[PDB]
Amino acid sequence: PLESQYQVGPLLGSGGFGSVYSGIRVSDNLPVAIKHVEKDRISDWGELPNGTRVPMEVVLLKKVSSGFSGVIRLLDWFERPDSFVLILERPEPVQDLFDFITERGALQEELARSFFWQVLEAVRHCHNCGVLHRDIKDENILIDLNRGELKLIDFGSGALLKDTVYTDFDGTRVYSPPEWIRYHRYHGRSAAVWSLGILLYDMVCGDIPFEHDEEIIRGQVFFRQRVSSECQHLIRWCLALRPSDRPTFEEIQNHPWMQDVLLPQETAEIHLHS
Template sequence: RNVMGKIKSFFSADDTNHLKKKGYTVLGDLGEGTYSKVKQASWVKPGDTSQVKVALKIINKKTAPKDFLEKFLPREIEVMKKLKHPNLIRLYELFQISSKLYFTLEWGGHGDLLQYIRLRGPLKDSESHKFFTEMCTGVEYMHQVGVVHRDLKCENVLLSKKNSIKIADFGFAREIGPNENSKTYCGSAAYAAPELLQGIPYKGTIADIWSLGVILYIMCCSSMPFRDANIKTLIKDQKDTLHIPSSVAGTLNSSLKDLMKKIMRFDLNSRFMMPHIKSHAWFI
């Protein structure tokens, strides 16, 4: 009853009527972003009779700041319209009711990767390999079509009903030229590449791959690779030899340890990029 009360208070009667006409029934809350709310809904597509579970991302344009509405939101819309890949969350529909903008998104039925790891602890080598391969496939496709994500983290990696990887949340994503650098500080510090933390103009593709390395470490070790209490400590840890927790050090595949160390090399020029990762012994 409380959930239904929340839903009613967020949507006006006009919103609810419009959603009903478009075939949507809002079922509950999924989460909240900086300027958005995400609801679970069922959707009967026009001309269809079967119900599909979807996520409705809703942005209230009245309360969102000008910088977000003029810069980040148009980028997110363009990126999501462009991306069509089995390992990326799909945009089905985009529409507006009064001041609210609605994204109808593919449903990630099994929650996010962080929840999954918290429930299970360090993942088996075979499962880490499957998930990491799917993530790399999705990210490589993005980079090939000229898009960088810039906020890759376990919370933004969803799992489908069949436990396939679905990369989500393109709020910081943007289209970028092959030789173009980014200057905007994006994402979470714990997953951020050293050059980004140091405020140096950075390549979005390289920053994305560093974040994939952090996610791989978390899957295998069920802990964070670096202390992130403050930026100074974080950068110091990134410079040091990658620490593997004693709880998993004895069981972790040596080839996997080698790959993680090479993806998260502090020195940009010797760091592994996607072609190196794909030809590495653990990945093949």
């Protein structure tokens, strides 16, 4: 059973993704997250190498879950009558980025730079493994408060990466690009970059830039907090209306605002240890 291998703790959250609990692996006291996803709520189905019908989320996690710690790793999974249960690694202590920004307000740019860089490395990792996340946002990023390391979670809206158009989307609308809003189509990397622009704005301003469809389509960015000119430029570049006008990942990481990033541990020591 899975009830014998894991001791279940408190509910960490629930929503469109399902219900996720804190847990402990009994054999070694490893901290885990236990994620329950209802079968009736799964639309994207995938196939395992051994030829098993499994949620796409599981396929994506396995493609991504090796070694590099910028993405939360899938440790095991189980099928139940009406659901799947995923066992995931859990950092401790940890706080998600949404809560972190909520508590602290807009982040100092040195901190925003470190966090954003780490998110970029994680997304680049996903793309390298042939996985598109499709729901990059503050709630789907965990902060390891001791090591200053960020982790990307929740691949339940994700897809295999491809070079042709996507015409389906079930991620977070306020992070979705104007081409999705207007035409119900987008390409993976350029849509990802748009969401990264929303994420970076959120980090340095303490809130997302657009609320309504018409604001997304107009794409006019206003800064409500003092933000450096280099940072404003990078944000407005990621949020270009035309997907082809958006930077590549290489271009983002070579942008002047992105230079001299702190190491994760330096980041924790300066900004998180308290």
